[PDB]
A paper describes a structure:
Here we present the crystal structure of the protein encoded by MGG_01005, a gene that is important for vegetative mycelial growth of M. oryzae. Importantly, the structure of a complex of MGG_01005 with an N-terminal peptide from MoDyn1I2117–150 together with mutagenesis studies reveal that a di-histidine motif, widely conserved in dynlt1/3 proteins interacts with a highly conserved glutamate residue in the DIC.
The 1.9 Å structure of the MGG_01005 was solved by single-wavelength anomalous diffraction (SAD). There is one protein molecule in the asymmetric unit (ASU) and the final refined model contains all residues except those between 80 and 112 that are not visible in the electron density map and are likely to be flexible or disordered. The monomer structure consists of two α helices (A to B) and 4 β-strands (β1-4). The configuration of this strand-swapped dimer and the magnitude of buried surface area: 1654 Å2 comprising 154 atoms from 43 residues in each molecule and a homodimer interface stabilized by 36 hydrogen bonds and 2 salt bridges suggests strongly that MGG_01005 is homodimeric in solution. Among these interactions, Lys68 on β1 of one monomer (Monomer-A) interacts with Asp127′ on β3′ of the other monomer (Monomer-B) through two salt bridges. The rmsd and sequence similarity identity compared with Dm dynlt1/3 and Cm dynlt1/3 are 1.29 Å, 17.9% and 2.33 Å, 19.5% respectively.
Residue numbers in the entry:
A (entry chain A), B (entry chain A): -2 to 79, 113 to 153
The structure:
């Protein structure tokens, strides 16, 4: 994946985002030995709720006099192993808005990858 | 794909979004007989730029006294045929913000699908 659009700094340090996403994916599918189409919905739901709860919490201003300053969208995709190329463009505020993507690579026996993308939008 | 989050009406009628996306995909990969990893970047770039240009244009207020009211993000993914499940959650304004997704199904010989997602964010 690669962004076509210029962008602002993440309200959350990208090393923390990486940890949030890696932990979310691990909690959801870490013990899974195979891709199971019957569980992908449950898996994706758990990943997204985990990440969203974490980024909402940690993007909050320390003081009550300042309300949440960022909207977030979080997408999670589970892809069964085979060829995949993704791109993102935007019409937004290049000083403040942006995206970050994460790939949770499954090993040989896993038979699936998890790709996560987070968008933040100021105000 | 399915959204986990409640949402507002599209600033552009969804039948028009469907046409924009279908035409963009057709223009980019309509004449392609096979999946080619060496062309996916060019294909995705064309699709996204086409869609973005169209949605920017048609979301503009008719009057100059009112500036653009929506930010947009557009993601395009080209997937080689094999198992794929996607989900989206959000922390946004449920009265005004939302997402829309489109799948351009490739026939047997095509060997690839195109999935498009558009997010709109008020103000």
């Amino acid at each position: 994946h690669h962004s076509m659009a210029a962008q602002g700094p993440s309200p959350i340090p990208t090393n923390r985002l990486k940890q949030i996403a890696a932990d979310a994916c691990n909690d959801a599918i870490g013990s899974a030995e195979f891709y199971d189409h019957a569980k992908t919905e449950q898996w994706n739901h758990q990943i997204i709720n985990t990440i969203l709860k974490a980024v909402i919490a940690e993007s909050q201003p320390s003081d009550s006099t300042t309300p949440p300053q960022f909207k977030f969208a979080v997408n999670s995709t589970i892809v069964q192993h085979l060829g995949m190329h993704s791109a993102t463009g935007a019409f937004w505020n290049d000083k403040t808005d942006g995206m970050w993507t994460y790939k949770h690579e499954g090993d040989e026996s896993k038979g699936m990858d998890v790709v996560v993308m987070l968008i933040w939008i100021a105000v």
